[PDB]
Amino acid sequence: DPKFQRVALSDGHFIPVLGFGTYAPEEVPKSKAMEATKIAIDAGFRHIDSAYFYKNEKEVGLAIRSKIADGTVKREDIFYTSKLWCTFHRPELVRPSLEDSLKNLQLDYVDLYIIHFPTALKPGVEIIPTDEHGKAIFDTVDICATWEAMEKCKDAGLAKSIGVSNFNRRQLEMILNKPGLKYKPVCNQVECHPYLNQGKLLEFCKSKGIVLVAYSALGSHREPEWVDQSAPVLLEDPLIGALAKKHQQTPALIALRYQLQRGIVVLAKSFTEKRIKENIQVFEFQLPSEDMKVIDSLNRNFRYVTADFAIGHPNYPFSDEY
Ligand SMILES: NC(=O)c1ccc[n+]([C@@H]2O[C@H](COP(=O)([O-])OP(=O)(O)OC[C@H]3O[C@@H](n4cnc5c(N)ncnc54)[C@H](OP(=O)(O)O)[C@@H]3O)[C@@H](O)[C@H]2O)c1
Ligand SMILES: C[C@]12CC[C@H]3[C@@H](CCC4=CC(=O)CC[C@@]43C)[C@@H]1CC[C@@H]2O
Question: Where does substrate bind?
Fold first, then answer.
């Protein structure tokens, strides 16, 4: 059943090539993630993407633990991802964060734990702490030291795999190039879609054996307001439409299947039963090379997530060409 297909990770673990995305806008109750994750699992999703940041880990864990108690899946059929938030980059905060997430999940490990952004922020009770205004408070933590703390999470059997998110090439190289590296990041999970296809990052990751995992592959939720206001809308792109018509597909399906054909692992968030069943048909067709080269033309280097809160940070990722 091709919908259960996985790509090899450099550490000998396997990751489903399509993942269920669980972030929703703050106004959306975390229970929807719960209801949506159950439905996604029934549909055949096995790879579930979350993060400390989405504050839905107790909800997703109930879902996953629901799907296990009724025979649907075994723990080892599920591939759960979570992410170290930037307020815990400090080595001594890394395990307790992940154990915190396990305690919430009521699971024994996560299959992938990754650094969410390379930009550390000031620890404490705010998720993104900001001053007497706007601006996040940066903290200065060496990414390699965060990395070592993550390697120790792997060694502890807490996370089967470890990786990063939103790193540029320079920042991957820093980890790669770490004197004494035990484990390489198995993936770099980054925004990826026809408007920001990531063709130089992707080539780089591959040459290094790192899996690129794409988020906002369907065009993001387009928040807040100002982005929704002027960002092009992926799923309505007239050329992605032409392509869906030609293959009798939907826009979403074209955009998902574009990523898979580049050996990207692609995430897809829907809390809509029907679009959940739809997204998993991505495996029911292919695009010829000539269609991939026409989608290539849509690239404009536009970002749905500039993560503005880390502008002026030492390690803000998006300044370099890639
Ligand atoms: N590493 C990171 O910093 C980071 C950042 C962003 C996202 N992510 C991960 O990536 C996942 C997905 O990315 P995302 O949140 O940017 O959203 P996305 O997958 O790009 O798309 C989300 C939007 O597309 C809609 N949609 C889903 N399927 C559809 C379908 N087949 N047809 C038409 N519309 C459809 C969803 O609507 P409905 O839900 O209403 O169906 C939702 O509004 C997230 O859930 C999160 O797990 C990680
Ligand atoms: C940009 C933002 C902070 C960063 C958030 C973003 C939406 C959800 C989100 C999911 C992630 O996985 C990374 C952080 C982000 C991208 C938030 C919406 C408005 C808020 O300012």
Answer: 23, 116
